[PDB]
Amino acid sequence: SNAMKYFQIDELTLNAMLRITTIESLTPEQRLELIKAHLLNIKTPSDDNEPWDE
Amino acid sequence: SNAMKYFQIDELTLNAMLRITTIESLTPEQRLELIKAHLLNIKTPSDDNEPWDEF
Amino acid sequence: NAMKYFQIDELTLNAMLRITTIESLTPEQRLELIKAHLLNIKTPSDDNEPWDEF
Amino acid sequence: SNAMKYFQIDELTLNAMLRITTIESLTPEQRLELIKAHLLNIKTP
Amino acid sequence: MKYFQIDELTLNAMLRITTIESLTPEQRLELIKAHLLNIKTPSDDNEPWDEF
Amino acid sequence: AMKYFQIDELTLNAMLRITTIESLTPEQRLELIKAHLLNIKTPSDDNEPWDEF
Structure with a gap:
């Protein structure tokens, strides 16, 4: 397929997930x-x- | 103005990461x-x- | 790698609308x-x- | 009160408006x- | 989005405090x-x- | 004439808790x-x- 869905991740969230690991x-x-x-x-x-979120 | 970086993730990779958890x-x-x-x-x-060529 | 968004405050947007x-x-x-x-x-x-540090 | 409302516009949307002009x-x-x-x-x- | 503004006086005070x-x-x-x-x-x- | 700096709500909340x-x-x-x-x-x-990244 020529088509794919993409999602956006902000830099702060990407870095937060890396730190969480x-x-x-x-x-x-x-x-x-x-x-x-x-x-x-x-x-x-x-x-x-x-x-x-609290 | 102010300017924010974002990254794009394809659905296959996002779902793979969800599954991996x-x-x-x-x-x-x-x-x-x-x-x-x-x-x-x-x-x-x-x-x-x-x-x-730096090595 | 990254992509980017710009953050428009409401007054800046409203100024452009007024100019129109x-x-x-x-x-x-x-x-x-x-x-x-x-x-x-x-x-x-x-x-x-x-x-660079502190 | 110390908080401000912002709108986020991707670069392609900005550049599209520039091209319409x-x-x-x-x-x-x-x-x-x-x-x-x-x-x-x-x-x- | 929602952002807060920090004046430079306050930011510099917090840096100095540290x-x-x-x-x-x-x-x-x-x-x-x-x-x-x-x-x-x-x-x-x-x-x-947040004020009570 | 004063310089102001923007901080997102999540980061401000996280700094409050980090203290x-x-x-x-x-x-x-x-x-x-x-x-x-x-x-x-x-x-x-x-x-x-x-950070290791």
């Missing part, structure tokens, strides 16, 4: 849960129920 | 390393290329 | 003024002090 | 109205 | 927090609920 | 606050000292 105060599964939350917000940007 | 046969740490590799791939300039 | 309705300027004059405003949005000021 | 087959009034419609779509999309 | 070694780190942090809360409050004049 | 997070020593909290203040004064594409 090695935050040592969180278990690895807690890090994955925060990463998944960010990826879902990228996929549906109007979601305003995130842990950082 | 819950792949049961990779440990959480392995999933995070695969996540990190995808995120660095997006961050790192794709093409601005090695000239070799 | 000034009837004693010809339409071409109003276009030229809006062009000049659009060109200024695309240019950065970046007049920050260069601090 | 020199479409010489449209009258100046037509170009101005097309640019106004794009500006209003930024303000209330 | 350097005052005769104050403890917690005192410096609390002084910076006060300035940041002053910038933030209220985030919306019509929704001043 | 007290218990997972960082007080000196670490002050270092991370300083790195944020440095990027308001002199933007760097959101570079911070602890």
